[PDB]
Amino acid sequence: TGFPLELLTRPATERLAYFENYTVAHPRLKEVYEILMRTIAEPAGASFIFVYGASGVGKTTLRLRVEQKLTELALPKLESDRARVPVVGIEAIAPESRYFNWKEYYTRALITLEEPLIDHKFDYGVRGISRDNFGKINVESKVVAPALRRALENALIHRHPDVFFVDEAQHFGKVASGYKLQDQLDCLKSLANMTGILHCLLGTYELLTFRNLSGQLSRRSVDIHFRRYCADSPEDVQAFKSVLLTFQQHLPLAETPNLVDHWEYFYERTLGCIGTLKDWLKRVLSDALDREATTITLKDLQKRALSVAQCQKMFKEIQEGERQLSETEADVQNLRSALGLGA
Amino acid sequence: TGFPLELLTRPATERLAYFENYTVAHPRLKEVYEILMRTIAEPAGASFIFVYGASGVGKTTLRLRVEQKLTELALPKLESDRARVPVVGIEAIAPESRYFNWKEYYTRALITLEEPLIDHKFDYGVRGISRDNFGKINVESKVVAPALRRALENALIHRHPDVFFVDEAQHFGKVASGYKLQDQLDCLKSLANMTGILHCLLGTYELLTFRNLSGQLSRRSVDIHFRRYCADSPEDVQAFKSVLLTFQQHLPLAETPNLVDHWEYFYERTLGCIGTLKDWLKRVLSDALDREATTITLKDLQKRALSVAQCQKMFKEIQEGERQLSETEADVQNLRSALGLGA
Amino acid sequence: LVVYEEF
Amino acid sequence: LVVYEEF
DNA sequence: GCATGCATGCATGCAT
DNA sequence: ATGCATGCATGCATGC
Ligand SMILES: Nc1ncnc2c1ncn2[C@@H]1O[C@H](COP(=O)(O)OP(=O)(O)NP(=O)(O)O)[C@@H](O)[C@H]1O
Ligand SMILES: Nc1ncnc2c1ncn2[C@@H]1O[C@H](COP(=O)(O)OP(=O)(O)NP(=O)(O)O)[C@@H](O)[C@H]1O
Ligand SMILES: [Mg+2]
Ligand SMILES: [Mg+2]
């Protein structure tokens, strides 16, 4: 339907913020959102939700939208269940050392489970954990890691969040010895088991090494592939063109530039990742607003585009991820033959 | 036009200082500065920006000028809010041991964020970090690196500076044997993602090791190349000659020496980077001023020129960087052939 | 082409 | 040959 | 060079 | 017056 026409009289900051707040519900995002919401609603023994995708595919935006929707849904019964918290969302920390630091992870997990009203959770742990007469839940450095884990699991049991979000889960792969990866993820698996809290792990394709560590681990996990648009299929090309048309209609400008004809260039330098296209269009629109230009030119798009080397690197990573994530009926027939009679 | 004529009666120190403070806005620096400011104004999700410039290119002066301009821009706004710092820039510390130290990096970054209006923040949220009560921020040696990182992240998110400048960023590559090179940048990516502050990395061509480490890093980084003035193109040679002419007209002597006639020698001993040319001209101007010479002679220039052995290594490193940083239409076709893009 | 609702 | 300006 | 957990010795607050 | 008990600071010991 296009942007509101009254934004033209508004300053450039208003138009820029409006374009920032705009979002597109393209079919892959909608399908992944519905699948994730359904899986969250009934974990059914699953201890992990591996949501992974192309760099630029908009995974974090999905996490934010899911958190907002779950909070909105929980508010009517949050009016009665004071102690509960609907969603807990934290970001994994890339460690400066060779191995992931679980102590900092536990500290930040406890910090995220912070309520300014103390009466909801008066006591959090054994000692050295309570707040310092402030909303911030300060933790003494001398508190040992297993005690911190115990306090975190007790807090998780008391609060009982619907889902625990760990954004950029690929940071868990920082370790020294090769087979230590199984222990690295088994720690989180035991945490989820005792806490009885479904964990959703989001990250890029670097976490595809996290897929099939063990039979128990593969059983406990659910895979949600955030597919990026691929030109090989005309349906994806049509969806990409529709998204480009929507972005063209919704960008605040005196006249709407024809971004559809340049879909070839856009895909090339975005690899079908909608988030990258949105960021690129945001950059170009900011450039135009600074210039107070009447329209977007191809020169403007080229000026703030991604380098060919960067796009090649992302494409190589995406190709490796999709190859690792591909399934064919031949594999199914092989599995059935291994089990027995196959049809 | 040129230098003020009244400086001739002034002592040698004043003329030397006037030439030291003089700067030239040559076209390459103008383009790089425009691109840098346009990216800084609207990062649009870019966690990193990379500025690859040769030795003597002028990256540090560029940082000082953009810092000054951004501070001037944000000065009128500081009346409304006094807790905002426009720009913070720190130099990367070369490690004494084999590993880049992140504890000292975090400590220096936190020190650089000190403000006389300490009452506005009044707390960093971590034990062991406080004000010295007179003019300093003192950090305890018992404060662990994750605690320092948490304090720095809280300070950054409170202050929200427009850009975090890291000069001599190639020191991050000073790491032990192994694939820790990717982790060195992953930690910074995680920090910038949490604080939401664009990190600008400036360094020589040794920074190319960080260029395309991973798909995510390549996507969320912007590559800015500070090209030197090449000798293979007439436009670059003419710009170099114009810069030489400006320096000739702006150096305070009784009679302006003819330097454009020796442009080949200047290019030979500077490889086109005008920062080295300015430094060498400052040296020769001081040498002439110590004896009150009326003009610059070829012998004076030769007495302080860089050794050819030095310039051979300079050119080897410059060629190594420029070969990697180059792109042609063949790369675009190769990318699109790999893609589903028919063209 | 298909218009897409805000998400 | 152009007398460039100051930065 | 730093991290991190654990043990010990000393200071101090309380109770008899 | 004072003895006891606990909390904290520091060394240390191994690992990275
Ligand atoms: N569906 C969408 N519609 C509109 N804009 C989007 C959408 N998805 C992503 N974006 C834009 O892209 C930005 C980045 O999205 P994000 O979810 O961080 O992508 P990513 O590929 O997961 N990035 P990373 O943090 O490196 O994993 C958002 O903040 C929006 O500006
Ligand atoms: N545009 C300019 N105009 C005038 N002088 C300049 C200019 N650029 C550089 N210089 C001079 O050259 C010096 C060195 O520039 P700098 O920005 O430190 O280059 P660099 O290659 O980043 N140095 P480093 O990498 O530390 O060896 C400056 O301090 C000035 O004296
Ligand atoms: Mg993301
Ligand atoms: Mg320099």
Side-chain angles (χ1 to χ4, degrees):
Chain A
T1 179
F3 62 96
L5 266 64
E6 60 274 31
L7 289 166
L8 305 183
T9 74
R10 305 302 297 134
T13 56
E14 301 270 55
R15 286 162 270 190
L16 176 61
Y18 164 77
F19 188 79
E20 204 287 324
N21 295 339
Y22 177 62
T23 320
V24 165
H26 58 100
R28 300 288 182 268
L29 168 70
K30 274 215 293 293
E31 141 177 350
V32 166
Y33 169 81
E34 162 266 358
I35 280 168
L36 180 59
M37 281 285 327
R38 189 40 51 80
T39 315
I40 275 183
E42 302 86 355
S47 306
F48 290 114
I49 299 184
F50 283 124
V51 182
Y52 34 56
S55 194
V57 87
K59 297 167 296 296
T60 303
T61 317
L62 174 71
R63 208 241 311 168
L64 291 174
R65 179 71 175 89
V66 169
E67 288 189 354
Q68 179 177 8
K69 172 60 174 306
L70 271 174
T71 302
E72 157 191 315
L73 180 134
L75 177 62
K77 293 179 179 179
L78 185 61
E79 200 52 89
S80 56
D81 313 356
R82 316 300 149 74
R84 83 169 289 102
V85 45
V87 198
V88 183
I90 88 164
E91 182 172 340
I93 317 303
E96 65 275 3
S97 168
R98 290 196 201 65
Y99 54 90
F100 188 80
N101 174 296
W102 282 103
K103 199 174 187 280
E104 177 74 8
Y105 170 85
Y106 292 146
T107 56
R108 287 177 185 267
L110 266 189
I111 279 161
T112 320
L113 282 140
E114 172 260 347
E115 181 58 50
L117 180 145
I118 165 176
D119 290 348
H120 290 128
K121 187 62 167 168
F122 175 78
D123 176 26
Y124 269 93
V126 290
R127 46 188 89 89
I129 282 293
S130 52
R131 33 198 282 155
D132 51 349
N133 168 40
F134 276 115
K136 319 309 176 323
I137 312 306
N138 174 282
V139 173
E140 319 317 282
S141 92
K142 55 163 281 313
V143 181
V144 71
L148 198 32
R149 188 195 194 267
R150 209 185 314 128
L152 171 63
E153 98 190 353
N154 257 279
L156 275 182
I157 287 311
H158 178 277
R159 305 289 208 160
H160 196 246
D162 293 4
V163 66
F164 194 89
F165 275 122
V166 180
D167 204 354
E168 260 158 340
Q170 66 269 24
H171 298 155
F172 284 135
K174 312 305 182 170
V175 82
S177 84
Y179 57 90
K180 229 276 165 186
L181 217 175
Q182 193 188 1
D183 326 302
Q184 184 71 288
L185 202 139
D186 274 340
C187 176
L188 207 31
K189 183 259 162 192
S190 166
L191 207 158
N193 206 5
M194 294 282 296
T195 53
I197 296 300
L198 172 57
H199 284 16
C200 173
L201 285 287
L202 296 102
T204 59
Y205 286 130
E206 290 147 342
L207 62 80
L208 288 185
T209 89
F210 278 30
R211 214 158 88 83
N212 297 335
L213 291 83
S214 162
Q216 152 84 298
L217 177 63
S218 199
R219 195 198 78 83
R220 291 297 190 103
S221 57
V222 176
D223 298 0
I224 302 183
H225 182 195
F226 210 135
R227 273 170 41 70
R228 58 104 195 177
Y229 295 97
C230 197
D232 289 345
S233 75
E235 169 190 323
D236 285 349
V237 177
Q238 171 83 4
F240 194 64
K241 278 162 158 158
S242 324
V243 169
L244 269 157
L245 173 82
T246 54
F247 275 137
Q248 149 174 330
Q249 284 194 14
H250 265 268
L251 62 80
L253 221 54
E255 69 203 301
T256 56
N258 183 280
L259 304 198
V260 175
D261 287 338
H262 310 294
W263 68 273
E264 276 264 313
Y265 181 51
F266 275 117
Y267 186 88
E268 162 193 327
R269 303 219 178 207
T270 50
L271 312 166
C273 293
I274 279 305
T276 61
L277 165 62
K278 161 72 176 297
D279 268 357
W280 182 6
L281 283 183
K282 176 97 170 21
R283 280 200 268 259
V284 177
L285 166 140
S286 73
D287 278 271
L289 288 175
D290 194 309
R291 296 212 320 263
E292 302 266 30
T294 327
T295 183
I296 300 295
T297 77
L298 181 61
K299 182 61 63 68
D300 299 301
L301 302 169
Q302 292 162 347
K303 217 203 303 293
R304 306 269 302 247
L306 304 181
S307 177
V308 53
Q310 299 172 278
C311 298
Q312 279 184 11
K313 180 62 176 184
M314 333 174 43
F315 189 49
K316 183 186 304 326
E317 179 173 294
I318 289 168
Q319 279 209 302
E320 290 302 320
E322 283 175 359
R323 181 183 64 80
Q324 237 174 10
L325 258 202
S326 67
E327 62 283 342
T328 85
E329 51 274 18
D331 290 343
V332 181
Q333 186 65 24
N334 186 353
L335 175 65
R336 300 254 294 262
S337 300
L339 291 167
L341 290 173
Chain B
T1 198
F3 63 95
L5 282 319
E6 70 270 24
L7 288 172
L8 298 178
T9 74
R10 301 309 306 150
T13 56
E14 293 179 32
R15 296 151 69 189
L16 194 49
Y18 161 75
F19 189 79
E20 162 59 40
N21 294 47
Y22 183 67
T23 54
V24 280
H26 55 102
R28 214 51 53 81
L29 189 174
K30 287 296 300 184
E31 293 156 50
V32 169
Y33 166 84
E34 187 60 34
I35 296 302
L36 160 64
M37 270 276 197
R38 284 271 54 73
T39 304
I40 286 303
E42 180 50 271
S47 164
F48 292 150
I49 75 166
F50 281 86
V51 186
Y52 314 84
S55 207
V57 175
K59 303 112 57 181
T60 309
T61 42
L62 175 52
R63 187 199 65 170
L64 287 171
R65 256 309 302 247
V66 61
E67 284 177 337
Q68 181 185 359
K69 189 61 174 285
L70 252 173
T71 304
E72 176 210 350
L73 255 296
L75 158 68
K77 204 273 191 173
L78 253 60
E79 303 176 29
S80 66
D81 189 10
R82 297 294 181 192
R84 149 186 189 75
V85 286
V87 171
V88 44
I90 88 163
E91 183 152 329
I93 275 273
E96 324 94 310
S97 59
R98 43 217 74 93
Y99 20 81
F100 174 78
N101 190 24
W102 282 90
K103 176 184 224 273
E104 209 49 25
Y105 173 77
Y106 289 149
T107 300
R108 272 149 190 291
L110 201 87
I111 293 191
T112 324
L113 273 160
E114 69 89 30
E115 205 71 16
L117 275 64
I118 187 65
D119 50 321
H120 279 64
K121 186 67 175 78
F122 177 77
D123 188 13
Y124 285 94
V126 174
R127 152 83 42 90
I129 293 103
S130 65
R131 194 88 189 194
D132 201 8
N133 213 46
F134 303 121
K136 283 298 309 167
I137 284 283
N138 43 4
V139 302
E140 295 295 331
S141 307
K142 325 161 282 293
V143 189
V144 77
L148 280 171
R149 181 179 184 303
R150 207 186 313 142
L152 175 59
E153 144 175 338
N154 293 29
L156 267 200
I157 202 171
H158 181 270
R159 295 269 145 86
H160 56 280
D162 256 336
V163 47
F164 196 91
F165 278 110
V166 179
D167 210 340
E168 306 307 300
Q170 70 266 32
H171 289 143
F172 280 70
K174 303 308 172 303
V175 80
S177 62
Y179 74 102
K180 212 168 177 180
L181 178 48
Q182 185 177 340
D183 307 339
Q184 275 281 338
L185 201 46
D186 271 328
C187 170
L188 202 52
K189 171 189 67 88
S190 180
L191 168 64
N193 207 338
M194 256 144 273
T195 85
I197 302 303
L198 173 52
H199 276 65
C200 173
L201 306 193
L202 302 116
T204 187
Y205 287 117
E206 294 148 45
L207 199 52
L208 289 189
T209 55
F210 295 80
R211 181 177 181 170
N212 272 12
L213 287 175
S214 170
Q216 182 176 49
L217 275 310
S218 40
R219 154 183 139 57
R220 67 202 336 184
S221 62
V222 180
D223 280 347
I224 294 184
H225 184 196
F226 206 157
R227 276 190 317 290
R228 77 190 174 84
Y229 287 102
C230 295
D232 301 346
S233 70
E235 50 273 60
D236 284 359
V237 171
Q238 194 79 11
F240 195 64
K241 283 213 251 269
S242 287
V243 170
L244 258 165
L245 171 146
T246 52
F247 277 139
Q248 153 177 326
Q249 290 169 7
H250 265 95
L251 77 92
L253 282 188
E255 57 198 320
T256 57
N258 194 328
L259 324 171
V260 291
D261 283 28
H262 324 119
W263 83 268
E264 288 197 330
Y265 182 62
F266 277 108
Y267 195 99
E268 169 196 299
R269 295 312 175 97
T270 51
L271 304 191
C273 56
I274 75 102
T276 305
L277 161 65
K278 159 72 171 284
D279 289 345
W280 175 21
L281 267 180
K282 156 75 134 28
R283 281 200 272 259
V284 78
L285 171 60
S286 165
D287 187 358
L289 245 190
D290 258 351
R291 66 210 183 69
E292 280 149 79
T294 63
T295 187
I296 301 300
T297 77
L298 188 56
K299 283 84 61 173
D300 303 297
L301 292 162
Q302 288 166 340
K303 255 178 135 272
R304 287 211 188 214
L306 300 173
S307 168
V308 64
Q310 297 172 271
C311 291
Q312 262 162 30
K313 165 70 64 168
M314 301 265 268
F315 187 58
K316 280 184 182 293
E317 172 173 312
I318 276 161
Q319 278 199 311
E320 200 57 29
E322 192 155 31
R323 187 262 298 185
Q324 291 185 81
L325 277 184
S326 73
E327 61 88 13
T328 70
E329 181 61 32
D331 318 73
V332 182
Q333 309 282 6
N334 164 17
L335 171 61
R336 57 207 310 170
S337 298
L339 279 160
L341 246 42
Chain C
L1 295 174
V2 191
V3 60
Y4 294 116
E5 54 182 359
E6 303 197 0
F7 199 69
Chain D
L1 295 174
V2 175
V3 195
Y4 289 145
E5 71 295 20
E6 196 158 2
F7 193 31

